[PDB]
Each structure stands twice: as C-alpha cells, then as structure tokens.
Design a protein around this ligand. Structure first.
Ligand SMILES: NC(=O)c1ccc[n+]([C@@H]2O[C@H](COP(=O)([O-])OP(=O)(O)OC[C@H]3O[C@@H](n4cnc5c(N)ncnc54)[C@H](O)[C@@H]3O)[C@@H](O)[C@H]2O)c1
Ligand SMILES: NC(=O)c1ccc[n+]([C@@H]2O[C@H](COP(=O)([O-])OP(=O)(O)OC[C@H]3O[C@@H](n4cnc5c(N)ncnc54)[C@H](O)[C@@H]3O)[C@@H](O)[C@H]2O)c1
Ligand SMILES: NC(=O)c1ccc[n+]([C@@H]2O[C@H](COP(=O)([O-])OP(=O)(O)OC[C@H]3O[C@@H](n4cnc5c(N)ncnc54)[C@H](O)[C@@H]3O)[C@@H](O)[C@H]2O)c1
Ligand SMILES: NC(=O)c1ccc[n+]([C@@H]2O[C@H](COP(=O)([O-])OP(=O)(O)OC[C@H]3O[C@@H](n4cnc5c(N)ncnc54)[C@H](O)[C@@H]3O)[C@@H](O)[C@H]2O)c1
Lengths: 339, 337, 337, 339
C-alpha cells in the first residue's frame, strides 16, 4: 500500500520479495527492482532459488525491462548509478540497499536526490550517521523525520540483540563475547581469488573462516548499556545457508541456572517477542530451521552455565529469510510511521 | 632462462608458478605478474593452496611491489590494462593472459603495444586464434606463431589420445561430456551472470553447460570436424575432473585392446602426457598428476565394437599448468630470439 | 485402504510415507514399519528432511512403540529378521524391503513365512526377480505377481521414454551414464566396503561405478538386450540426479523433434511420469518433482541424426517414492483379495 | 624397535601409519593390522587418502593376508573378536584401539588375554579406570606397570589441555566454557539414517551439528585443578577435517591484555611445548593447517579479552594427523618407559 523499490537485487532481496509476495497484507508496494543483470535472468533467479527453490507461484516476464509475478507486474532497473534510478519518476518512498555499497549516509542520500523519500540499509552502516533500527529493539524508538534514512545491520546482529537485551534486563549480564557460525556468502570466494580480507578470500566451500562482525558494536550501538560489553568473531562455515551463534556471558544475578532462563527465554519469546523470538526444545541441527520466520530459535538443551553467572546460550537464524521478515515488518512500521 | 610474464593471476597462474619453481631446470623465467590483487595479499594467497596446501618454499614480498620465491624475486603489478604493464619496460618476451578477458586478438595486442614479444593464453582463443597442444600441434608451432592460445584443460586432455584413437581404429564420430568441476566462471552464490547456469550458486548444484572442446577438437583436428559435439557438466566439486565419451570408430574392437593401445601411447609419446589407471580411483587419486590424462582402462567399454565409452581424468589447473609449462618451453624452443 | 507395511526404513521409506500421507486419496495404508532405529528417534528423523525440511504434519510417537501422523498412528518395530516381524500377526498384505539385504527371493520369503501376502522391493531384484515400472510393465503386473521388485530410481527414469524412443525411431543401440548422487551405499568417510569406490569417503569425491540399469533396461525391455550398457557416476551431491545418454537410433532425425515427441509422450502417458524442461535448470530446480523424468529438451542433441545425446533428471528418492506409490496402487488394483 | 599392532584400522590408524612410516626413527614396530576389510582394500585405502592422498611412497600386497609398504611387509588381521587376534602369537606389546569399541578397560584387557603386553586407547575411555595420558600434560607422569593399559582421549581434548594448563599456570584461569568446530566423522551420518544421537544422525555433509565432547571432563580429568572448571559443546562442521576450537575464560590475573598472553603463548609453544604447540600470526583459515604436526596453532589476531579477565582464544588442530603424532610420541615414550 506504499511504494517501494529494492536497490540491488541481492539474494537477500530475492528472499525479501519472496516474503513480500508471501506476505499476508504487505502494506508496502515493491514495484521496481535494481540489479544490472537482465530481467529474464532476474525472473529466472528469483524463480529458481537454491536454499528453498522456485517461487511457489508464477513469475512471468512482461516487457523485458519490466517482468511480472502472478499477474502482478514489477518494474526493473539495472544500474550502479544512484541518480540514474527513477526514484523521482517512480515516486519511490524507500530505498532498499541490497548491495552493501552505500554503507555511507551520503551514498544512500544519492538515491534520495534521485527522488527517494527514505532509505533503509539492509546492512551495518560503516559510519554511524544512520539509525541501525532493529525489531523488538529500537523499532518502537523509530520516529518519522527522525533521520528518515535509517539503517539495519546484519541478521547476525539482529538475531542477537533483542533477547540478550531481555537477558541483561531480567537477569543482568556483566559482559560476554559471542561467536557465531555464519555461512559463506558472495563476499567469500568460492575459490581462492583476489580479495581484500585474506580469510574470506579463500575457497569458501572448503574452509571455515575466522572473521569478525560489526555486531559486537551494533549491539552496543542499539544497547548503549552494552557499550564495549560484547565482543565476538565471525566463523564462516562452508554450510549452504544456516546462521547460528553461541555466547557465554557472566550474568549479574546470583548465579542462577540456565534452565530457569530458558523458561524465561521462551516466556519472553512467547511474551513480548512472539514470532520474533523462539526458544525450541527439540534437539535439532542446521537444516532443522530452514525458512523459519523466527529472528532466533533457542534450544534449552544447549544453553548452559559455567560459573553460576558464567552462562552459555545457543540459537539460530536465517541470514536472509528471518532478516527478510525483519525488513518487511520494519518497513510496515515505517509505513505506520509514514504519513 | 627466457624472460616470462604472467597476467591475470588466477589460481591458474598460481599453480603454474608452483610447477615452474618446482619445474626441473625450468628453461623459462617469469619476472613479473599482473592481477587486481595486491602484493602481500597475493603472496599469502599463493603461499597456501586449498588443494595442495601451502607452498613448499618460503615466499615473501621481496619489496612492497615484488615477492621473493626463496629469494627468487618477481615483480607484482596490478592493473586491468596491458598497456599499463611493463612489457616494453621489462622487455617482456611473453605475457600470459589469465584474466580471460583478452580472448580476442586485440586483447593480446595491447600487451604487444606495451612491448610484448609473444602472448600465450590459458583460454580457448575466442575466434581465429591458434592453440598448440603437446603431442598434438606443438610441432606446428613456429616462432612466427607469436599469438597462440590454449583451450580449456578439458579439451587438451581429450585431444591427443582421441586423435590416436581415430588413428587407431578411425573414429567415425561420437560426442561427449565432462564431469567438469565448478569455478569462478560460475557465481559462488546465485549472482547475475551472462549464463544463468554460470549465474547459479552451483556450490550445491551440478551445472549443465558446454565447452569449445566440441569444436576445439575439430579446431585442433580439422579432421575431427563435427565428429564430436560434447557438452560440459559443471559439477559441485572444486577439483580435478574426469571426462565421459563414447565414440563411433570405423574398425571394430574390444575395450581392453583400446586400453592396451592407450598404455602403449602413454609410453611412446603420451608418456608424461597420459596415464592409464586400472585401480578403483576417484578425483582425489589424480591430484598433482602431471599426465594430462588418466585412462580408467579398468572401466572403458565399447558398444558394438565401435561405440567406445571411455574414462580419463584431468586436473582443473595443475595438469593444465604443466601443459602451459612445456608449451612455454617449446616457445623457448625455436627461440633463436 | 489396503494394509501396507514398510521395512528397512531408509530415507527411501521416509520420503515414501511423506508422499503417502501427502498422497491424494491414498488407496493404501501402511500400518507398521521396521528398522534398526527407535521410535522417537525415527519420528524425529522423518519429522525433518534435510532436503524438503520438516514434515508439514505433526508426527508424535503415539505410544512408545508407535507414532502418530496427525493422529494417524503406525506401529514402529525394529529388527533384522522378517520372521520377527508382525506380518501374520498384523495380517500384513505387503512388506516393503528397504534394508537392501533381502535382494534375494529368499529374503522376501522370510516375510511371507512370518505371514506376508506380497513383498515389494525398492531395489533391483538381485537375480530373477520381476520389477514392474509405470508405463513400462505395470500392465504385465498380475495378482499372481506376489514377489516383484523395483530397480534404482535411475533405471526407472530411463526405461519408459527410451522405450518410446526405440518405438519412435528405433534405437539400434547406445550406452549411457548418470550423474548419480552419493548415498549410504558409499561410506561417508573412507571406510571399508565391498566396493573400494563405495568404500571411499566420496563426500568430496566423484565416484565411478555402475548400475543394473545397463541390464535393468534390457531386463524390463528384453528387446533392449545389450543395446545399452551404461555405468554410474556417484557425484558429490546428496540430491536428485540427472542422466546422460547417447543412443544410436535407426531412423534419422533432429533433437528438437525428439524433444517434441518427448513432450507429447509426457502428455499422452508419460504425463505425470515425465516432464520436459527447457529452461536453464539445475538439481535444485527438480526437487519434490513427481514426474520421474525431466527432459532437458533445451540441451538434448543428436549426432549424425542417429547419435542422440539426451538430458533428463530424476529425484534420488522422492520421484522414486512416487513410483513406489503408484505401483503399490496398481497392487491395490487387481486386488480382489 | 618395539612390536606394535593397530587394533582397528580407522582413518585415524591410516594417518597414524602414515606418520609411522613418515617417522624419522620410529622406535616402534607396527607389524599387523586389524580391520575386517580385506588386505587389498586396506592397501588401497591407505594407498589412497582423501585429506592428503596416496602414500607418498610405495605400498604393495604380499600374500593377501599380509601386504607390504616399500618392501617393509605388514601383517594384517581382520576381526571383531579381541581374543581372536594373535597378540600372543605376534607377541604384540601394545594394542592400538582404532575402533572406539572397547571404551571399557575390560574390552582392552581382552586383547591382553589374547597375548598383549599393553593397550592404548585412541579415544576417551567411557569409564575412568584407564589413564587418559596426554603429551605435555601427564606423559611425564606416565609410569610403567602403572596401569600398563592407558588411554588417550580425543584430539579435541589433547589440543586444548596443555596450553590452557599453561594459561591457568602463568596467568590463572578462573573458569570457562569452550566450543570447538569439529569436522564430521564416521559416527556422523552422510545422510539422515538410523542412529542413536539425533544430531549426528542427520545428513552430516549438510548440517552443522550441535553436540558435546568428553573433553570438558577429560581436561578436568588431566587437570584436577580444572574439575568442573570447563564446559563446552561440540560443533560438527560438514567440512572434511580441520579441527578448531574457541573458548573465553575469566583469567585470575589483574585483567591483562590478550596480546601479552599470545607472546607468552608462543613463548611456551616455543619453550617447553616446542613442536607440540604453535601460536601462528598469519591470518589463516581451515585449509591453512592441513597436515600440521602441531597439537595446536594459535593466531594472535584472534584471541582477545572481553573484561580484562574475560579472555578469548582461538586455535586449530588435525583430529588425526596431530592426534596421530601424539600416539606416536607417547608410544615412543612408552617405549622408553618400556623395559
Ligand atoms: N548475506 C546476508 O544474508 C546479509 C546480511 C546482512 C547484510 N548483508 C548485506 O547485503 C549485501 C548484499 O547481500 P547478498 O549477500 O545477497 O550479496 P550479493 O553480492 O549477492 O548482492 C549484491 C547483488 O547486487 C549487485 N550489485 C552490486 N553493487 C550494485 C549496485 N551498486 N547497484 C546495483 N546492483 C549492485 C551484485 O552484482 C549482486 O548481484 C551485502 O553486501 C551485505 O552488506 C547481507
Ligand atoms: N578453472 C580452471 O582451472 C581453468 C581451466 C581451464 C581454463 N581456464 C582459464 O583460466 C581463466 C580463469 O582462471 P581461474 O579459473 O583461475 O579464475 P580466476 O577468476 O581466479 O582468474 C581470473 C583472475 O584475474 C583477475 N582479472 C580479471 N580481469 C582482469 C583484468 N582485466 N586484468 C587483470 N586481472 C584481471 C580476476 O580478478 C582473477 O583474480 C580463464 O581464461 C579460463 O578460460 C581455467
Ligand atoms: N539413493 C536412493 O535413494 C536410492 C536409489 C535407488 C534405490 N535405493 C534402494 O534403497 C535402499 C537404500 O535406501 P537409502 O538409500 O535410503 O539408504 P539407507 O542406508 O538409509 O537405507 C537402509 C536403512 O535400513 C536399515 N537396515 C539395514 N539393514 C537392515 C535390516 N536387515 N533390517 C532392518 N533395517 C535394516 C539401515 O539401518 C538404514 O536405516 C537400497 O535397497 C537401494 O537399492 C535407494
Ligand atoms: N575421528 C577422530 O579423529 C578421532 C579422534 C578421537 C577419537 N577417535 C576414536 O577413534 C575411533 C575410530 O576412529 P575413526 O574416526 O577413524 O572411525 P572409523 O569408524 O572410521 O574407524 C573404525 C574402523 O574399524 C572398523 N571396526 C569397527 N569396530 C571394529 C572392531 N571391533 N574390530 C576391528 N575393526 C573394527 C570399522 O568398520 C571402521 O573401518 C572412533 O570410534 C573414536 O572413538 C577418533
């Protein structure tokens, strides 16, 4: 019900549009796509996913600048130039950075100059000038005309932020340093190839990769009471596409069990963080969470305690699917915050 | 000895120089390398293969713009334009296109403009471009052949022995395919590319595609015009591939005989170029193997004494790299200047 | 409706029951399952595929020895001996060998001794054992055919349309191979096994091997005796495979015509059994596909108007499972008792 | 120089024999192999490795009960029965449990009854009756006739034990809970198959697996001052083999840097734990450590501090290759402890 245009049709944007058409009453209107890749290819790409597969409904190609989905037509642009995108012509309220290119405020504002009303960053802003808004976190704290170009850091971050917040909230966390198991992505190198970071520069499919994540900061960003409270490094598994993290923290409580917390875990996940947060009980593995709208799913049989307060936690997420849903409902809120 | 230069430092050139240093009395000498990457970055990179592993020789960045190879310093440059590259500067005798973009006569011509003597290509020369292959046309190499190429390792594997097979019984025709492993030519994840198949992630997907081999064999063997038109199957492995092929030969026979002739050839001339494997062996059992071809004589079969199924493997780069080695040596041959 | 029983609950039977519950008006009824695993273990297991994912239906262990399927309770048993299994007890009409060990007449006979009416097999019946295939010999199925089998999904994919192809132009001969994905038949790591190839880890290694298809087609088509002898390439994917084949047909033609006839057949009878795919598509693009065969008409080619390269895919189990479904239904057909 | 016989030719035993023939002056004589798999296959198996490949020297098959390697012949047995192995006939001083079957003392003592002098367990003893001896840890504390059947837990354990010991030694570690990245193994299921542990029962090649490891106990075993000090769960990556672990601990020091420790790290690794321990500096990934004799290799750019004492550490190991070397030099010490 509000004009939208994806800026860069990353796999992220692919899953995103999957959710959008898979959305019940999406208050938003994604009408034109940006990716310099040809519409027939695009239609194919989204029409043939790997992680889950073909769109579970028709996709057609009206005039090859502008294909369709189930009769519902979609415009497409294909450029690397921001100003060369008809944000003004197409009257697009919101830019969906699906390239990670403009990790700068100005880069996004370029498309605003090209006639955009707002920009959202589907990534951590390399600067700080952009509000990295998160569901269940600062989404409520979002305001219209309050930096109408807001950002949204990695799924990695978003998966962790809210519930650990609730954890330091109900129990109090002294500190802690996480570590995830991220799955390889385009930034990684299918084969050892010319690339900046030595690590992800290696052949991805055949190497776990020690890297880091802006999350440990982004969490402190969204949780200023977490400033310098969390560290943690990114482990990049040659896994198809399954995101999952662990972290041990020192609680500020007396040194309670982990069990009780898992109870409180699911409680809040069933409470204020319904749909957003899960705490499952079934002993499950990576594939056991494909295409799960939960920003996180904890398994109690995992999270534990070392030293009363030294307490461990495990949970999962889909770097896109969930992240996609996050984009969805934030924009929907933005739409509510929209005039 | 002969001053060499590599360009577009793909894993291709990486394994290549790994062989070159490992080459016994390399009559050639690479002195510089171009690729978009940086000096220490590339040094680190080559220092550790994901298949062989680390390099069994210290390589440090001897200078901020060059790297040593146990002291063997080689200049590292980084550009997307051959004219920006020290060919006439370093008096470069030969540039090695690894970028895959100068698949044209013109692309190589740019290096010659910057002062290159000859240009050799790891890729099928897109268009009327000569490709010499050991035991195949390598004799047809002349010093006048300053601009010549090399088709996909896949092709080069097939060429010689299938030539002998047409020379053995007379291959009326027969098409093929290959268990080719993926590569950068296929996007790691589903990213936009000229070929939708190539565009696919394919990290977990077999890719149907093709290769100039279908014609490259007809190319290298005009006699083999149209007698074969095979396609390419980009498999979800990162590794050495094997090839499928059934042919229609004129003389009738049985597989075992063909296998024996295979061994014989891998003794007479295909020695070092070709091996005959009879044990139950898989991709792992063919790595760092210098014979371009490993005949699975144990499994090759013939239908109707004419329809000859065959199995033989080929290393994505390592073997191909060796092919590059000895062809470059042939260039050092007939090299009065 | 008809009381069914599955044995050796491999991923085969898992996907099978997933289809069966998902089957529209399943005229059949599985009531019990045997496999070495345990009740809640297996329930959890089937509850989550690694390819489809979770089961879109609650399955709990209804009883400590049985599990529900949204309330549809089915007994779970665990043994290595059919005589230990409630065939005469539960009055079992049909047992489904998934163990792969009762590849003999005798193996199935054990179930009949414990009170089985008929026994069907997911495997190529090792020895003189009938295998019926939809659109192939399914009509030859008689109620007297109490002990009949089913060869590898690979085979069943090939049979019908290649039959029509011999019926279309007349396949003089021609052998094949398949991009078959690995399985438990190959050891996860390099562990001892009857076949060294199968013994190999192969998680990262293409495996050359064979399949009874080379004869199973001659089996199902005695007419096809010796006209094909193809081998198996166990590929490092866990998934649906595609098949390579070039044949020698008697009537000359062009690929596109063959493709059109393919579509036509996939309308007349191969409808639901077969699909014709023309888009650039890979293994992912064929999952949970019920047509046993997906002709890549877009890439099939012919040499000399007789040497016909072909591409068509087949799901390791899911499609095969569907084959099991409708053959079992045919058993429910001609089932006066 | 002392009679040896591998009991169960696991991939572990394969790498082991690789090292043994690859050993400079192996004071031990592995003469006969146990695995019910046929000698021709065996010869093939070892003669064709995956993780590194064919034996880098000849292997032949003398009479198919008894093949050879580079002229050096090797007997072979093939059984699951302990008493049915010619420990007495072949006069084998030491049993090399390469099956994990006899995680019990009695199971090993069976082969002693079949005429063995000693048994070593290439695995964690499920009981406790067996000394889980470790290089740089209790290897010095090993004594002859002191439970001549001693054990040796997982590489996982052995990788961690010694240096973390030195860490709580020089700096003092309050507590901590690790987590590794183990690579799938035969116990895992290439495809979802009938199996006890739900997790590794899943298709391994396509799932990270949440499991645990006896290590957190084994470390407390070998480090009684670590009793209940460490926990941590096993993460099973679908990668061929490139074992690696992380752990954050609270130090008992003032809250020092991690850097200084990395210095002390390599120092001890260069000091008493030469060859045994590595602390590399190059930013590297999984494949960057294939076939490395170091029980562990730390990279400094990884290990860090959260709360002064809350300190993180990363290091790697080969579940067999290194572990193999461990078996080697312990037996060699055993040989020195041997009369
Ligand atoms: N991988 C994730 O799940 C994830 C999570 C958090 C953040 N992100 C951010 O999302 C970005 C893209 O997500 P992805 O993982 O699908 O990456 P991707 O590289 O697959 O997506 C980028 C796509 O857009 C194209 N493109 C690049 N620059 C462009 C430009 N300026 N204009 C238009 N198209 C352009 C690329 O060629 C490619 O097709 C990343 O760079 C990252 O910063 C992704
Ligand atoms: N996969 C193989 O081993 C194999 C086998 C047969 C043939 N080839 C040929 O090798 C080439 C690809 O090599 P690869 O497979 O190692 O892939 P690759 O992508 O690693 O090689 C290309 C490299 O050159 C760089 N590059 C691209 N354009 C450049 C330019 N204009 N100037 C400088 N550098 C540039 C890229 O960034 C990259 O580092 C192609 O020519 C291909 O036909 C590859
Ligand atoms: N890859 C495929 O999907 C495929 C292809 C074609 C045919 N098949 C046939 O399917 C069977 C293998 O199934 P799979 O591929 O799912 O492998 P699988 O190993 O998962 O199936 C065998 C299952 O049966 C169990 N089992 C073994 N022996 C048993 C016995 N005596 N009693 C009870 N249970 C026993 C095993 O523990 C295992 O759970 C073979 O008969 C094979 O020919 C499978
Ligand atoms: N994976 C590792 O690196 C590692 C590290 C620590 C512990 N371990 C221990 O080592 C054991 C084997 O190591 P692996 O990972 O190579 O496993 P594996 O299953 O590959 O090795 C066992 C081999 O011996 C055979 N076998 C089984 N029981 C036997 C018996 N009673 N007698 C003779 N042969 C028998 C098996 O069929 C197989 O061929 C595991 O069970 C585990 O407890 C291994």
């Amino acid at each position: 019900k509000l004009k939208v245009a994806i800026n860069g049709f990353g796999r992220i944007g692919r899953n995103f549009l999957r959710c959008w058409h898979g959305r019940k009453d999406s208050p938003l209107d994604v009408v034109v796509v940006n990716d310099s890749g040809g519409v027939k290819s695009a239609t194919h790409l989204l029409k043939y996913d790997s992680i889950l597969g073909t769109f579970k409904a028709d996709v057609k190609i009206i005039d090859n600048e502008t294909f369709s989905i189930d009769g519902k037509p979609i415009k497409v642009v294909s450029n690397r130039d921001p100003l060369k995108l008809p944000w003004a012509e197409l009257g697009i309220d919101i830019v969906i950075e699906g390239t990670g290119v403009f990790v700068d405020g100005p880069g996004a504002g370029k498309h605003i100059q090209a006639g955009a009303k707002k920009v959202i960053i589907t990534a951590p802003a390399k600067g700080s000038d952009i509000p990295t808004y998160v569901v269940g976190v600062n989404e409520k704290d979002y305001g219209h005309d309050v930096a109408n170009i807001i950002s949204n850091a990695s799924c990695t971050t978003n998966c962790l932020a809210p519930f650990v917040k609730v954890l330091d909230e109900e129990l109090g966390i002294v500190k802690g340093t996480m570590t995830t198991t991220h799955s390889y992505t385009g930034d990684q190198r299918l084969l050892d190839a010319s690339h900046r970071d030595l690590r992800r520069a290696r052949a991805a499919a055949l190497n776990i990769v020690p890297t880091s994540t802006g999350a440990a900061k982004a969490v402190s960003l969204v949780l200023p009471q977490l400033k310098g409270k969390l560290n943690g490094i990114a482990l990049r598994v040659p896994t198809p596409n399954v995101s999952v993290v662990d972290l041990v923290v020192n609680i500020e409580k007396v040194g309670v069990t982990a069990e009780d917390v898992n109870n409180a875990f699911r409680k809040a996940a069933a409470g204020p963080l319904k749909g957003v947060l899960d705490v499952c009980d079934i002993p499950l593995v990576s594939v056991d969470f494909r295409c799960s709208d939960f920003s996180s799913t904890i398994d109690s049989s995992l999270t534990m305690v070392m030293g009363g307060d030294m307490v461990k936690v495990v949970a999962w997420y889909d770097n896109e699917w969930g992240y996609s849903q996050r984009v969805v409902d934030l924009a929907d809120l933005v739409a509510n915050k929209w005039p | 000895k002969l001053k060499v230069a590599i360009n577009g430092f793909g894993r291709i050139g990486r394994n290549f120089l790994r062989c070159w240093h490992g080459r016994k009395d390399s009559p050639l000498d690479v002195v510089v390398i171009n690729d978009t990457g940086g000096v220490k970055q590339a040094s680190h990179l080559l220092k550790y293969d994901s298949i062989l592993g680390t390099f069994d020789a210290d390589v440090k960045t001897a200078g901020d713009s060059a790297i040593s190879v146990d002291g063997k310093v080689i200049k590292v440059v980084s550009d997307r334009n051959p004219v920006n590259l020290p060919w006439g500067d370093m008096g470069i005798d030969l540039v090695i296109e690894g970028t895959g973009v100068f698949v044209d006569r013109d692309g190589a011509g740019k290096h010659l403009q910057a002062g290159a003597k000859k240009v050799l290509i790891t890729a099928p020369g897109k268009g009327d471009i000569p490709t010499y292959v050991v035991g195949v046309n390598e004799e047809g190499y002349t010093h006048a052949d300053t601009i010549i190429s090399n088709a996909s390792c896949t092709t080069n594997c097939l060429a010689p022995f299938v030539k002998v097979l047409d020379q053995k019984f007379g291959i009326i025709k027969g098409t093929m395919t290959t268990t080719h492993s993926y590569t950068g030519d296929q996007r790691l994840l589903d990213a936009s590319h000229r070929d939708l198949r190539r565009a696919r992630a394919a990290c977990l997907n077999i890719v149907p595609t093709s290769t100039g081999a279908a014609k490259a064999v007809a190319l290298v063997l005009p006699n083999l015009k149209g007698k074969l038109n095979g396609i390419a199957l980009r498999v979800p492995t990162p590794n050495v591939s094997v090839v499928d092929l059934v042919v229609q030969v004129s003389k009738k026979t049985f597989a075992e005989e063909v296998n024996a002739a295979f061994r014989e050839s891998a003794d007479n001339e295909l020695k070092g170029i070709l091996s005959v494997c009879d044990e139950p062996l898989v991709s792992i059992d063919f790595r760092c193997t210098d014979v371009s071809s490993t005949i699975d004589s144990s499994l090759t079969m013939v239908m109707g004494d004419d329809m000859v199924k065959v199995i033989a493997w080929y290393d994505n780069e390592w073997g191909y790299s060796q092919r590059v080695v000895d062809l470059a040596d042939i260039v050092a041959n007939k090299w009065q200047a």
